C-alpha cells in the first residue's frame, strides 16, 4: 500500500457501487446503465442517473443476472467510472472488482483484458461477492471469530440467493435462489394499495409503493396479532403519505396500512405473491445447509449473514433466525421421538454495513497490505498471460 | 404457516367430516350450545385477514373444514356488503345472502369436493344443509358490526379491500 | 494491388493439397492420438514444409502431416501503427483460441498468427470451406487493420480540434 | 513377474517368483486413486473452477476417469497445452453447466511419477518399480522385466504402460549402463495391460 | 445412389454375403448394422464391446461371422446366436491401435494391420477353444494402413506408412494345405516377402488384388495409382493424377480399377497389358419415363459430387472383381453410395471398361 | 465526454449534502473520506477534533512546494479567504466549512471547493502570463514535477508564453497511438488559426540540454500561448484547459484502445460465424 | 534427473529414410541467345534428387530460379505447355524453392509460374511437392 488507495468497484445487475479502499461507504452508488445514441461517436454516452430518461439516447443494461452480457458497453461504462466519477488515473491504482458466484473463468479473463489492455491498471483482483459479504459481517458485535465459512443471504435486484461458503470458497453446487426480492415487495405493496387507496396517479402507482416500502415497512412476528393491533389502535399504526401529481400538479393524500407489514412478509410466505413458488426463505436456507457436507452444517447454521437492501427491513434477521430454529428443532423432535442429537445453534447475523455489504467488504480488504500481495500485477499479466486472473486466492 | 382451529375436542360432533361445533347464536339449527365465550365463528373472523392470503392449507382435523367454510363465506359477505350504504342496508342484504341455497359438499359448484365428505343420507343432508345456514347467518351477523364504522353510513375500507382476495383461490359462488 | 489475387490463388491451391487428413492413432504411445505436425516424433508421418511468398515481408508457411496441418501467416505491416494494431489484433484472437478451434495459442516463431487444423476439424467441417476460411481471413485481417488505422486518425483529429477550439 | 496394482485406496508392487509371492521386496506406493482425484481438485482450482473437496469429490472423480491420461514426455505435453487447444475437452456437470479442461488432464496423473507435486516423500511409480527389480537376484531380474502386469482401477490411464517403459529405459540406461547408448538396444521390457 | 447414415464419418463398413445388411462404424466405439426395408434403411443391431474407436470391419460371407478391430488394441469375432451378436475376444498382443482387418477368402483366418508395425494373422484352435495369431514383422517399419488377400487365401498385400506396397505369405499350415505355385513365386513360407514396391513414393492408403491375383494395385498419398503384374516380372505401371490422393481402390475387371478419395468422387483407370501402362478413363460421378421426369431442372456443401467429404472405402457389391456390376463407397461425410456399373456405362458414352 | 471535467465530484457532492442537512436542521452525521485525483493528488474530508459541525477538505500534492515558489499561497488566499486554514498534517491546503456559518448562497463555495486542485496550479500560470503582459523577459522558467517522472516547464518570452510537458507512455502500444494524436495537434492550426500552436518531440527534449528525461517512451509536447490566450479575459479558461492537457491526452489514448477492442470483438465474432457455417 | 535423455533417439524402430546438377553452361547458352523455353528444359535436367549437399541443391535451384526470373509474363504458358508431366512436377518443386528467397519482385513472377504450372499440373503436382521424400 502506497500513497494512494485502491479503487473498489462492485458492479451489480441494478447498481454499481464505487469509491476508494478505506472508506466506509461507496462514494457513488449509480444505476448500472449506459445511454447511447465514425469519429468519437463511441464517446457520446452517459451512465447512472443521468442515463435514465435522456430524451435522445437509448438506455442499456449491460449486466444481466449479475453477468456482463455486453462487453463493449461494460468497457465504456468503466471509462466514465474511472475518469468521470472516481477521477482515478487508472495507471496508479490497484483495482478490486467483484463477481457473482458461478461467473466463468473466461469472463475473468475478459475483465482482465479490459483492465490491463485498455486502462493499464498496475494490479487487479476479482473477489466473489458472497465472500466479501462474509467479510463485511466481521463488523458485527455478535462476531468474535473472524471466519469465511457461513451462509450468505444476498437479496439483490431480482432474486435472493442463499449462498453457502466454506473457507473462502462458495460451494457452487449447493446454491439456491428465491424468486423474491425488493421489486416484488414493491409490486405486492402496489397491488395492496391499488385496491384500497383512491387517487394514486395510475402513472405514479409504482413510485408510490416504493416510497411506502422504503419509509414504512417492516417484518412482524405474527400476522394475526399484527392485524388486530392495526384493527384496534388505528392512530398508532395507520400512517399518511402525501405525493404530487406529476401531470396536473395536484397533491393526493393516502393512508398506509397493512402493507406496512405484508410487504416484507412475502419472504416468509411467497404464496402470497408468487403463484408458482411457495417455499419460505427459511425452508430454503435449511435445505441448502442440509445439502452441504455434513461436517460443515453446524458452522453454516451458526453464521448466516445478510447482504442487500431487502434484508434491511427491521426484524428480518430475528424472524429468519426464529423460523429457521423452529424448522430445525421440528426435525430434531421427529428424530428423538422416532427412537437425541445435539441441538442446532442457529445464528442470523445483522450489522450496519448490510445494504452494501459487498462493497464494504472489498473496501476493507483492499485497505490491507495482504491485498497488495494477492493481486495480480501487470508484469504478471504480461509475462504469464490473462489466465492468471482465472484464480483469485482468498485472504483475510 | 396458516392459522388453524384449536376448538376440536377428541369427542366433538361430526356432520359429514366437518365438525359440528358449538356456536352461541340467535338462530335456528343443530349447532350445539357453548359455555365458553369464543366460537368457531369468532376464530374465523379473527383469523380472516391473515388467512385469506393463503393459497395452501393443511386440513389437520375436522374443525379446520368448518373454519375453511366460514373463511370462504366471510368473503361472500364482503362481496355484497361493499357496494351498499349504511349499516341498515347491510344487515338487510345479509339476511338475503344468508338464506340463499349455497352449494354444499358433493355438488357441482362446491369447491373442495375432494376434501369435504358428502352426506351419506337425506338426514345428514338436511342437517348439514341447516348447520351451514346457521353459520352463514351468525357469521353474516357478527361480521356486520365489524365492517361498519361506528360513525355510520360507513363500509370500512379496512375490510372492503379484501373483497378481491380469494382464500385458496376458491369461491363458494 | 496487382499481386494479391495471384498470391491468394497460390495459397489456396496449397491448402487444398495440405488439408487431406485422416484419423491417426499414435505409433509412439498406447491409446494416445496426437497431432503429428506438433508432436513430430514419427518423421514418416510428416510432409515437406512449404512457403508461398507475396514479397519479402508477406508469406504463408504450410506444414502438413497425416493428421494435421499447421498454417502460419506473416501479415502485411506497413508502418509502426499497423505493426502494433496487428500485434494487438492477433493477440486478441489468440486469447480466444478455445473458441476458434483452429487457432494456435501462439504463432510459430517468425509469423504473426498460426492455425492448427486437424482431422477432427476436417471430419466436422467441410474441408473446402476451411480452405475458404483461411483465405477469407487473410483478406479480412488487412481490411480490419486498415480500418482500425483510419479510425485512430479520424478520432485523433476530432480530439485535437475539440481541445484546440476551446481556447 | 511383477504386479503393479493401484486402486482408489492404494498402490502395491508385488514381485512373484514362479508360483509364490515374496513379501520381502514387496513395496507400497503412498499415492493412489483418491490422491490423484484430490490433486485434480487443486489443478481445477488454479483454472478457476472451485469444487468443494467433499461436496464435489464424486464429480471430480468422474472427470478424472473420463479425461485424465498419462503424459509420455511432460515437457512436450506442456508445449501442446500452452501452444494449442487440442487437449481441451468439454465436460458437463451435474447441474448442466459446461466446463473446459485441458492441461490438467495429464497433470493430475503425473503425481504418480512425481509425488513431490502432491507433497509426498518418495520416488514415484517407475523409480519404485525399478528399485524393486534391481534388488532381486541378478538372474530373476530379466524374467521380471518381461512380466510386469498392471492391475486395478488406477492403472487404466491411456498412455500409462508407454510412460513406464520409457521411464525404466531412462533409469536402466543411467543407473545400469552409465550412459552407454549402444548397449541399450538389448534391454527388453514390455508391460502388457491385460484387456480383462 | 446416395444414402446418409449420419453426418460424421463412416470410418469403415462391411456387407453380408447377400448384400442385405451393412455394418458401419459411425465414428465411435460401436458398430451399427443396417437392413433395407422396402426403400428405407433400418438399424437392426448395435455391437458395443470395443473400448476405443473401431477402424476395421470385415464380414465373412459363408460363416456369417463379423471381425472388428479398434484403437483399443482389441479384435473381436462376432457370432450370431439367435438374434443377437456375441463378441469373442482375440488377444492380439499388440501395443498400439489396430488399423485394418480382412477375413481371408477361405474364412479360416483373418489379418489385422496395426500401429505396432506388424500384421497379425489370426486363426482358431478346435483344441483350446480360442483364436491365436502369428505376426508378420520384417520389413514393415510403420503403421499398416491397408490389406487385401489373394484368392488363394495365402498371399497378402499390405500398404503402409513406410511408403510401400508389399505382398506377403500368410501360410498357416495347421488350417490349410500347402499352397500352389503362383506367378508371385513358388515358395510361400509364412511371412515370406514376395514383392516390395521400390521407388518409395507416398503413404499407401489402399491395396487390391485382381480377381485372378496376378496383378496387385495400390493408391498412395502422392496421388499416383500403381499396378504390378506378376505375369510380367512384377513390372510396375504408374499414373500420376492431377488431383487429390485416392484412399480406396478396387478391380472391377482384370484390367479395370475404380478408386476414390479426397476429391470425393469415384474414378476409373484401365491397364493395357500389352503396353504395360495405366490410363485415366474416368470420373464416374457426373451431375425410361420416370428418369426423364425427375432430372428436369426447376425455376429459382457447394460441391458437384454425391459425397460431401472424402471417400475412404470402396467395395465390390456384385459380380466380384472379374466382372463387377455394382459397387459401394462410404465416406468421411457419413454417406453410403451404391454405383451401378451398367447405368454408368449407359449415362457416360465416352466410357470404356478394360 | 471528450473534455475532462475540471471540478471534483466527490468534493462537490459531499459538501452539498452536508450543507443540505445543515439547512434542514438535521443532526450532522460524521464524515471521513479519503480519495484521489489525477496525477498523485490525495484528498481528505473530515471532522476536525471529531466536531461534526465542522467539515474540512484537505489536498495533498507531492509537488506543492514547487507551486508555492510561484504564488500559490497568495492565490489561494485571494480565492478562499477565511475558508483557508492551517493545513492538516499530511496535506498542503485545508479549507474549513462551519456548518453553522454558511453563505446564503452555497453555490459559489461548493464550486470553488471542487476546484481545489486546479486552484493549486493556476498561480504558476498567472505569474508567467503577467511577465508577458509586462514585457519582463529573461525570467527563469517554472519547473513543476507534477508526477514522479513527468515535468512541466513554463517560460515567458517577448511575444508568447510556452508550456512544455515532458510525458511518459508506459506502454509501447501507447507511444505509437500517442504519436498519432500528437501529429494531429501539431496540425490543429489548420482548423483554428487562432489556437495555440503545438509542437511535439519524440524521445528528445526541445533543444532550449539540462537534466531532462530521454527515452523511447518519452514525448515532449509544447504549447505556444499568445496574448489572446494569456490575457486577463482568456487566462482562466486557458488554465482550465492546459492543466488538464496531459490527462486529456492519456485518456484519449485509452478510449481509443477501448474502441479498437469493440472493433476486434465485432470482427472476431464474424469470423466465428463463418467458421460455424462450415459445419454440416 | 534421469528423465533428461530422450531414449526414443535410440529405438530399434525409428523410421529411417532409404538411401548430378543441371549443366550451367547449357542454360546460359540458351539464356544469352534469347531461347527461354530451351533454357527451361535444360535447367530441369538431372535434378540432384539424391545428395546430402545443400550446396549442390542451392546451385540447381538458383540456376532454375534464374531461368524463371528472366521470362516475360506472356511467355510462360507456352514454355510450361512444352513440358511433360515429370517436367511440371519438377518445375512446381522449384517454384516452391523459389518462394523461400524472395529477392526483388521475383516473388511476383514466381507467382505467375505458380499459376501456369498449376494449370498444367493440377493440385496433384503440389501434392507431390509435399509428399516427396527426396527433394530439390
From Swiss-Prot, chain A:
Pfam families linked to this entry: Actin
CDD domains from the UniProt entry: ASKHA_NBD_Arp3-like
Gene3D superfamilies: 3.30.420.40, Actin, Chain A, domain 2, Actin, Chain A, domain 4
GO biological process: Arp2/3 complex-mediated actin nucleation; cilium assembly; positive regulation of lamellipodium assembly; positive regulation of transcription by RNA polymerase II
Molecular function via GO: actin binding; ATP binding
GO cellular component, one term: site of double-strand break
Record keywords: Acetylation, Actin-binding, ATP-binding, Cell projection, Cilium biogenesis/degradation, Cytoplasm, Cytoskeleton, Nucleotide-binding, Nucleus
Taxonomy, superkingdom: Eukaryota
Annotated compartments: Cytoplasm, Cytoskeleton; Cell projection; Nucleus
N-acetylalanine modifications at: 1
Modified residues (N6-acetyllysine): 225, 229, 236, 239
PROSITE patterns noted in UniProt: ACTINS_ACT_LIKE
Acetylation in keyword set: yes
InterPro entries for the chain: Actin (IPR004000), Actin/actin-like_CS (IPR020902), ATPase_NBD (IPR043129)
Protein family per UniProt: Belongs to the actin family. ARP3 subfamily.
Assembly description: Component of the Arp2/3 complex composed of ACTR2/ARP2, ACTR3/ARP3, ARPC1B/p41-ARC, ARPC2/p34-ARC, ARPC3/p21-ARC, ARPC4/p20-ARC and ARPC5/p16-ARC. Interacts with WHDC1. Interacts weakly with MEFV. Interacts with AVIL.
Protein name as annotated: Actin-related protein 3
Organism listed in the record: Bos taurus (Bovine)
UniProtKB/Swiss-Prot annotation, chain E:
WD repeat intervals: 5-44, 49-88, 93-134, 139-178, 241-279, 306-349
Pfam families: WD40
Any GO CC annotation of this UniProt entry: Arp2/3 protein complex
Location of this chain's protein in the cell: Cytoplasm, Cytoskeleton; Nucleus
Sequence intervals crossing the membrane: none
Stored InterPro entries: ARPC1 (IPR017383), WD40/YVTN_repeat-like_dom_sf (IPR015943), WD40_repeat_dom_sf (IPR036322), WD40_rpt (IPR001680)
One Gene Ontology term of the molecular function aspect: actin filament binding
One GO BP annotation of this record: Arp2/3 complex-mediated actin nucleation
Domain of life: Eukaryota
Keyword annotations of the record: Actin-binding, Cytoplasm, Cytoskeleton, Nucleus, Repeat, WD repeat
Protein function: Component of the Arp2/3 complex, a multiprotein complex that mediates actin polymerization upon stimulation by nucleation-promoting factor (NPF). The Arp2/3 complex mediates the formation of branched actin networks in the cytoplasm, providing the force for cell motility. In addition to its role in the cytoplasmic cytoskeleton, the Arp2/3 complex also promotes actin polymerization in the nucleus, thereby regulating gene transcription and repair of damaged DNA.
Annotated family: Belongs to the WD repeat ARPC1 family.
Quaternary context: Component of the Arp2/3 complex composed of ACTR2/ARP2, ACTR3/ARP3, ARPC1B/p41-ARC, ARPC2/p34-ARC, ARPC3/p21-ARC, ARPC4/p20-ARC and ARPC5/p16-ARC.
Protein name, per record: Actin-related protein 2/3 complex subunit 1B
Native source organism of the sequence: Bos taurus
The organism's taxonomic lineage, starting at the top: Eukaryota, Metazoa, Chordata, Craniata, Vertebrata
Swiss-Prot record, chain F:
List of residues that carry N6-acetyllysine: 273
One of the Pfam families matching this protein, by short name: P34-Arc
Cross-referenced InterPro entries: ARPC2, ARPC2/4
A cellular component term, taken from the record's GO annotations: nucleus
GO biological process: actin filament polymerization; Arp2/3 complex-mediated actin nucleation; positive regulation of actin filament polymerization; positive regulation of lamellipodium assembly; positive regulation of substrate adhesion-dependent cell spreading
Keyword hit for Nucleus: yes
Gene Ontology MF term list: actin filament binding; structural constituent of cytoskeleton
SUPFAM superfamilies listed in its UniProt record: Arp2/3 complex subunits
Disulfide pairings: none
UniProt entry keywords in alphabetical sequence: Acetylation, Actin-binding, Cell projection, Cytoplasm, Cytoskeleton, Nucleus, Synapse, Synaptosome
Subcellular location(s) of the protein: Cytoplasm, Cytoskeleton; Cell projection; Synapse, Synaptosome; Nucleus
Record-linked Gene3D superfamilies: 3.30.1460.20
Primary site of residence: cytoplasm
Complex formation: Component of the Arp2/3 complex composed of ACTR2/ARP2, ACTR3/ARP3, ARPC1B/p41-ARC, ARPC2/p34-ARC, ARPC3/p21-ARC, ARPC4/p20-ARC and ARPC5/p16-ARC. Interacts with SHANK3; the interaction probably mediates the association of SHANK3 with the Arp2/3 complex. Interacts with DNAI3; this interaction reduces binding of the Arp2/3 complex to the VCA domain of nucleation promoting factors.
Family, similarity comment: Belongs to the ARPC2 family.
Name of this protein: Actin-related protein 2/3 complex subunit 2
Swiss-Prot record, chain G:
InterPro entries for the chain: ARPC5 (IPR006789), ARPC5_sf (IPR036743)
Classification via Pfam families: P16-Arc (PF04699)
Span list, region Disordered: 12-27
Modification note: Polyubiquitinated by RNF128 with 'Lys-63'-linked chains, leading to proteasomal degradation.
GO MF annotations, alphabetized: actin filament binding
Single GO BP term: Arp2/3 complex-mediated actin nucleation
SUPFAM superfamilies: Arp2/3 complex 16 kDa subunit ARPC5
Assigned keywords, A-Z: Acetylation, Actin-binding, Cell projection, Cytoplasm, Cytoskeleton, Nucleus, Ubl conjugation
Gene Ontology terms: cellular component: Arp2/3 protein complex; cell projection; cytoplasm; cytosol; nucleus; site of double-strand break
Location of the protein in the cell: Cytoplasm, Cytoskeleton; Cell projection; Nucleus
Family according to the record: Belongs to the ARPC5 family.
Annotated function: Component of the Arp2/3 complex, a multiprotein complex that mediates actin polymerization upon stimulation by nucleation-promoting factor (NPF). The Arp2/3 complex mediates the formation of branched actin networks in the cytoplasm, providing the force for cell motility. In addition to its role in the cytoplasmic cytoskeleton, the Arp2/3 complex also promotes actin polymerization in the nucleus, thereby regulating gene transcription and repair of damaged DNA.
Subunit structure: Component of the Arp2/3 complex composed of ACTR2/ARP2, ACTR3/ARP3, ARPC1B/p41-ARC, ARPC2/p34-ARC, ARPC3/p21-ARC, ARPC4/p20-ARC and ARPC5/p16-ARC.
This protein's name: Actin-related protein 2/3 complex subunit 5
Species whose genome carries this gene: Bos taurus (Bovine)
Name of encoding gene: ARPC5
Amino acid at each position: 500500500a502506497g500513497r494512494l488507495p485502491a479503487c473498489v468497484v462492485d458492479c451489480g445487475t441494478g447498481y454499481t457501487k464505487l469509491g476508494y479502499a478505506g472508506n466506509t461507504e461507496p462514494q457513488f452508488i449509480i444505476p448500472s446503465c449506459i445511454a447511447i445514441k465514425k469519429g468519437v461517436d463511441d464517446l457520446d454516452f452517459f451512465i447512472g442517473d443521468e442515463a435514465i430518461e435522456k430524451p435522445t439516447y437509448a438506455t442499456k443494461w449491460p449486466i444481466r443476472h449479475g453477468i456482463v452480457e455486453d462487453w463493449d458497453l461494460m468497457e465504456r461504462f468503466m471509462e466514465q467510472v474511472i475518469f468521470k466519477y472516481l477521477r482515478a488515473e487508472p495507471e496508479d491504482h490497484y483495482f478490486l472488482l467483484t463477481e457473482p458466484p458461478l461467473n466463468t473463468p473466461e469472463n475473468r479473463e475478459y475483465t482482465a483484458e479490459i483492465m490491463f489492455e485498455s486502462f493499464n491498471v498496475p494490479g487487479l483482483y476479482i473477489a466473489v461477492q458472497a465472500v466479501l459479504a462474509l467479510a463485511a459481517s466481521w463488523t458485527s458485535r455478535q462476531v468474535g471469530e473472524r471466519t469465511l465459512t457461513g451462509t450468505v443471504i444476498d437479496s439483490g435486484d431480482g432474486v435472493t440467493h442463499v449462498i453457502p461458503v466454506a473457507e473462502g470458497y462458495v460451494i457452487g453446487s449447493c446454491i439456491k435462489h428465491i424468486p423474491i426480492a425488493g421489486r416484488d415487495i414493491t409490486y405486492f405493496i402496489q397491488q395492496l394499495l391499488r385496491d384500497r387507496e383512491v387517487g394514486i396517479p395510475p402513472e405514479q402507482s409504482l413510485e408510490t409503493a416504493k416510497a411506502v416500502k422504503e419509509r414504512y415497512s417492516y417484518v412482524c412476528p405474527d400476522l394475526v396479532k399484527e392485524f388486530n393491533k392495526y384493527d384496534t389502535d388505528g392512530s398508532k399504526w395507520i400512517k399518511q403519505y402525501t405525493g404530487i401529481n406529476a401531470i396536473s400538479k395536484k397533491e393526493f393524500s393516502i393512508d398506509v396500512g397493512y402493507e406496512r407489514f405484508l410487504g416484507p412478509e412475502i419472504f416468509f410466505h411467497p404464496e402470497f405473491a408468487n403463484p408458482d413458488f411457495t417455499q419460505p426463505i427459511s425452508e430454503v436456507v435449511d435445505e441448502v445447509i442440509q445439502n452441504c457436507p455434513i461436517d460443515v452444517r453446524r458452522p453454516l447454521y451458526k453464521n448466516i449473514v445478510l447482504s442487500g437492501g431487502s434484508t434491511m427491513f427491521r426484524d428480518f434477521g430475528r424472524r429468519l433466525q426464529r423460523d429457521l430454529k423452529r424448522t430445525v428443532d421440528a426435525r430434531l423432535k421427529l428424530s428423538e421421538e422416532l427412537s437425541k442429537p445435539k441441538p442446532i445453534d442457529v445464528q442470523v447475523i445483522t450489522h450496519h454495513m448490510q445494504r452494501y455489504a459487498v462493497w464494504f467488504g472489498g473496501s476493507m480488504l483492499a485497505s490491507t497490505p495482504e491485498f497488495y500481495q494477492v493481486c495480480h500485477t501487470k508484469k504478471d499479466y504480461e509475462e504469464i498471460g490473462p489466465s492468471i486472473c482465472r484464480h483469485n486466492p482468498v485472504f483475510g | 404457516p396458516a392459522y388453524h382451529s384449536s376448538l376440536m375436542d377428541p369427542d366433538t360432533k361430526l356432520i359429514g367430516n366437518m365438525a359440528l361445533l358449538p356456536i352461541r347464536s340467535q338462530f335456528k339449527g343443530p349447532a350445539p350450545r357453548e359455555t365458553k365465550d369464543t366460537d368457531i365463528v369468532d376464530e374465523a373472523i379473527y383469523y380472516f385477514k391473515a388467512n385469506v392470503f393463503f393459497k395452501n392449507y393443511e386440513i389437520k382435523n375436522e374443525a379446520d373444514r368448518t373454519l375453511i367454510y366460514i373463511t370462504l363465506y366471510i368473503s361472500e359477505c364482503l362481496k355484497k356488503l361493499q357496494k351498499c350504504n349504511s349499516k341498515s342496508q347491510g344487515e338487510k342484504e345479509m339476511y338475503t345472502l344468508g338464506i340463499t341455497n349455497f352449494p354444499i359438499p358433493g355438488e357441482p359448484g362446491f369447491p373442495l369436493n375432494a376434501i369435504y365428505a358428502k352426506p351419506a343420507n337425506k338426514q345428514e343432508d338436511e342437517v348439514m344443509r341447516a348447520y351451514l345456514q346457521q353459520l352463514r347467518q351468525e357469521t353474516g351477523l357478527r361480521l356486520c358490526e365489524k365492517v361498519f364504522d361506528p360513525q355510520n353510513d360507513k363500509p370500512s375500507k379496512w375490510w372492503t379491500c379484501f373483497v378481491k382476495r380469494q382464500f385458496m383461490n376458491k369461491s363458494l359462488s | 494491388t496487382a499481386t494479391l489475387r495471384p498470391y491468394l490463388s497460390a495459397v489456396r491451391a496449397t491448402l487444398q493439397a495440405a488439408l487431406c487428413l485422416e484419423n491417426f492413432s499414435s505409433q509412439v504411445v498406447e491409446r494416445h492420438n496426437k497431432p503429428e505436425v506438433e508432436v513430430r516424433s514419427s518423421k514418416e508421418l510428416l510432409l515437406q514444409p512449404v512457403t508461398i511468398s507475396r514479397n519479402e515481408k508477406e508469406k504463408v508457411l504450410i506444414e502438413g502431416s497425416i493428421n494435421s496441418v499447421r498454417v502460419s501467416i506473416a501479415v502485411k505491416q506497413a508502418d509502426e501503427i499497423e505493426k502494433i494494431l496487428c500485434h494487438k489484433f492477433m493477440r486478441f484472437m489468440m486469447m480466444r483460441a478455445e473458441n476458434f478451434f483452429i487457432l494456435r495459442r501462439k504463432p510459430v516463431e517468425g509469423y504473426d498468427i498460426s492455425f492448427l487444423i486437424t482431422n477432427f476439424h476436417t471430419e466436422q467441417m467441410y474441408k473446402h470451406k476451411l480452405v475458404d476460411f483461411v483465405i477469407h481471413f487473410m483478406e479480412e485481417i488487412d481490411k480490419e487493420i486498415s480500418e482500425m488505422k483510419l479510425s485512430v486518425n479520424a478520432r485523433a483529429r476530432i480530439v485535437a480540434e475539440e481541445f484546440l477550439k476551446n481556447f | 513377474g511383477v504386479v503393479v496394482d493401484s486402486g482408489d485406496g492404494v498402490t502395491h508392487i508385488c514381485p512373484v517368483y514362479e508360483g509364490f509371492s515374496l513379501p520381502h521386496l514387496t513395496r507400497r506406493l503412498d499415492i493412489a486413486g483418491r490422491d490423484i482425484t484430490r490433486y485434480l481438485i487443486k489443478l481445477l482450482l488454479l483454472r478457476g473452477y472451485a469444487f468443494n473437496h467433499s461436496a464435489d469429490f464424486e464429480t471430480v472423480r468422474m472427470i478424472k476417469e473420463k479425461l485424465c491420461y498419462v503424459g509420455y514426455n511432460i515437457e512436450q505435453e506442456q508445449k501442446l497445452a500452452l501452444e494449442t487447444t487440442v487437449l481441451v475437452e468439454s465436460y458437463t456437470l451435474p447441474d448442466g453447466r459446461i466446463i473446459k479442461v485441458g492441461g490438467e488432464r495429464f497433470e493430475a496423473p503425473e503425481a504418480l511419477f512425481q509425488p513431490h507435486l502432491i507433497n509426498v516423500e518418495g520416488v514415484g511409480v517407475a523409480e519404485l518399480l525399478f528399485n524393486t527389480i534391481q534388488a532381486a537376484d541378478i538372474d530373476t531380474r530379466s524374467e521380471f522385466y518381461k512380466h510386469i502386469v498392471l492391475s486395478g482401477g488406477s492403472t487404466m490411464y491411456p498412455g500409462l504402460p508407454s510412460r513406464l517403459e520409457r521411464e525404466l529405459k531412462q533409469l536402466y540406461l543411467e543407473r545400469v549402463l552409465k550412459g552407454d547408448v549402444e548397449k541399450l538396444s538389448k534391454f527388453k521390457i514390455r508391460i502388457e495391460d491385460p484387456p480383462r | 445412389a446416395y444414402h446418409s447414415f449420419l453426418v460424421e464419418p463412416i470410418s469403415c463398413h462391411a456387407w453380408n454375403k447377400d448384400r442385405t445388411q451393412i455394418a458401419i462404424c459411425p465414428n465411435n466405439h460401436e458398430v451399427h448394422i443396417y437392413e433395407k426395408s422396402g426403400n428405407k434403411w433400418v438399424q437392426v443391431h448395435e455391437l458395443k464391446e470395443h473400448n476405443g474407436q473401431v477402424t476395421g470391419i470385415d464380414w465373412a460371407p459363408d460363416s456369417n461371422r463379423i471381425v472388428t478391430c479398434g484403437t483399443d488394441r482389441n479384435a473381436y469375432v462376432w457370432t450370431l446366436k439367435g438374434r443377437t451378436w456375441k463378441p469373442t475376444l482375440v488377444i492380439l498382443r499388440i501395443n498400439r491401435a489396430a488399423r485394418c482387418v480382412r477375413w481371408a477368402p477361405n474364412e479360416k483366418k483373418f489379418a489385422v494391420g496395426s500401429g505396432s508395425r506388424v500384421i497379425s494373422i489370426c486363426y482358431f484352435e478346435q483344441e483350446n477353444d480360442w483364436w491365436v495369431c502369428k505376426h508378420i514383422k520384417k520389413p514393415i517399419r510403420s503403421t499398416v494402413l491397408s490389406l487385401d488377400w489373394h484368392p488363394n487365401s495365402v498371399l497378402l498385400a499390405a500398404g503402409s506408412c513406410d511408403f510401400k506396397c508389399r505382398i506377403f505369405s500368410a501360410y498357416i499350415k495347421e488350417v490349410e494345405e500347402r499352397p500352389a505355385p503362383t506367378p508371385w513365386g513358388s515358395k510361400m513360407p509364412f511371412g515370406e516377402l514376395m514383392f516390395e514396391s521400390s521407388s518409395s513414393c507416398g503413404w499407401v492408403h489402399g491395396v487390391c488384388f485382381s480377381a485372378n491375383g496376378s496383378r496387385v494395385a495400390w493408391v498412395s498419398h502422392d496421388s499416383t495409382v500403381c499396378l504390378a503384374d506378376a505375369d510380367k516380372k512384377m513390372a510396375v505401371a504408374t499414373l500420376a493424377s492431377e488431383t487429390l490422393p485416392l484412399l480406396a481402390v478396387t478391380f472391377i475387371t482384370e484390367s479395370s480399377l475404380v478408386a476414390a478419395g479426397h476429391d470425393c468422387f469415384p474414378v476409373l483407370f484401365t491397364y493395357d497389358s500389352a503396353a504395360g501402362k495405366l490410363s485415366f478413363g474416368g470420373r464416374l460421378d457426373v451431375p425410361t419415363a420416370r428418369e426423364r421426369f425427375q432430372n428436369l431442372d426447376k425455376k429459382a456443401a457447394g460441391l458437384d459430387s454425391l459425397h460431401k467429404n472424402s471417400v475412404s472405402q470402396i467395395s465390390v457389391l456384385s459380380g466380384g472383381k472379374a466382372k463387377c456390376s455394382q459397387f459401394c463407397t462410404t465416406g468421411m461425410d457419413g454417406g453410403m453410395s451404391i454405383w451401378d456399373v451398367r447405368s454408368l456405362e449407359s449415362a457416360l458414352k465416352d466410357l470404356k471398361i478394360v | 465526454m471528450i473534455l475532462l471535467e475540471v471540478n471534483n465530484r466527490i468534493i462537490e457532492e459531499t459538501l452539498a449534502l452536508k450543507f443540505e442537512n445543515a439547512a434542514a436542521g438535521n443532526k450532522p452525521e460524521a464524515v471521513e473520506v479519503t480519495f484521489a485525483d489525477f496525477d498523485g493528488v490525495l484528498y481528505h474530508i473530515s471532522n476536525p477534533n471529531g466536531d461534526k459541525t465542522k467539515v474540512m477538505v484537505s489536498i495533498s500534492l507531492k509537488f506543492y512546494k514547487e507551486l508555492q515558489a510561484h504564488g500559490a499561497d497568495e492565490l489561494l488566499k485571494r480565492v478562499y479567504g477565511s475558508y483557508l486554514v492551517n493545513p492538516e498534517s499530511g496535506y498542503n491546503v485545508s479549507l474549513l466549512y462551519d456548518l453553522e456559518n454558511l453563505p446564503a448562497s452555497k453555490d459559489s463555495i461548493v464550486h470553488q471547493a471542487g476546484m481545489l486542485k486546479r486552484n493549486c496550479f493556476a498561480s504558476v500560470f498567472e505569474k508567467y502570463f503577467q511577465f508577458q503582459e509586462e514585457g519582463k523577459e529573461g525570467e527563469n522558467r517554472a519547473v513543476i514535477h507534477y508526477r514522479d517522472d513527468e515535468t512541466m516547464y513554463v517560460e515567458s518570452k517577448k511575444d508568447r508564453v510556452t508550456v512544455v510537458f515532458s510525458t511518459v507512455f508506459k506502454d509501447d502500444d501507447d507511444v505509437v497511438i500517442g504519436k498519432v494524436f500528437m501529429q494531429e495537434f501539431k496540425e490543429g492550426r489548420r482548423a483554428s488559426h487562432t489556437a495555440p500552436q503545438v509542437l511535439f518531440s519524440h524521445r528528445e527534449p526541445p533543444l532550449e540540454d539540462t537534466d531532462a528525461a530521454v527515452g523511447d517512451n518519452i514525448g515532449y509536447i509544447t504549447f505556444v500561448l499568445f496574448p489572446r490566450h494569456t490575457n486577463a479575459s482568456a487566462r482562466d479558461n486557458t488554465i482550465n484547459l492546459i492543466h488538464t492537457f496531459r490527462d486529456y491526452l492519456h485518456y484519449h489514448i485509452k478510449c481509443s484502445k477501448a474502441y479498437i477492442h469493440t472493433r476486434m470483438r465485432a470482427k472476431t465474432s464474424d469470423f466465428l460465424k463463418v467458421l460455424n457455417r462450415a459445419r454440416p | 534427473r534421469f528423465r533428461k535423455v530422450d531414449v526414443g533417439e535410440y529405438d530399434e524402430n525409428k523410421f529411417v529414410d532409404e538411401e548430378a546438377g543441371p549443366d550451367e553452361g547449357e542454360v546460359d547458352s540458351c539464356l544469352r541467345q534469347g531461347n527461354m523455353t530451351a533454357a527451361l528444359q535444360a535447367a530441369l535436367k538431372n535434378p540432384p534428387i539424391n545428395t546430402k549437399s545443400q550446396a549442390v541443391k542451392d546451385r540447381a535451384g538458383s540456376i532454375v530460379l534464374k531461368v524463371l526470373i528472366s521470362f516475360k509474363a506472356n511467355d510462360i504458358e507456352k514454355a510450361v505447355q512444352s513440358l511433360d508431366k515429370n517436367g511440371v512436377d519438377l518445375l512446381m518443386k522449384y517454384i516452391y524453392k523459389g518462394f523461400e528467397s524472395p529477392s526483388d519482385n521475383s516473388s511476383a513472377v514466381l507467382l505467375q509460374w505458380h499459376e501456369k504450372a498449376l494449370a498444367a499440373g493440377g493440385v496433384g503436382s503440389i501434392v507431390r511437392v509435399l509428399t516427396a521424400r527426396k527433394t530439390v
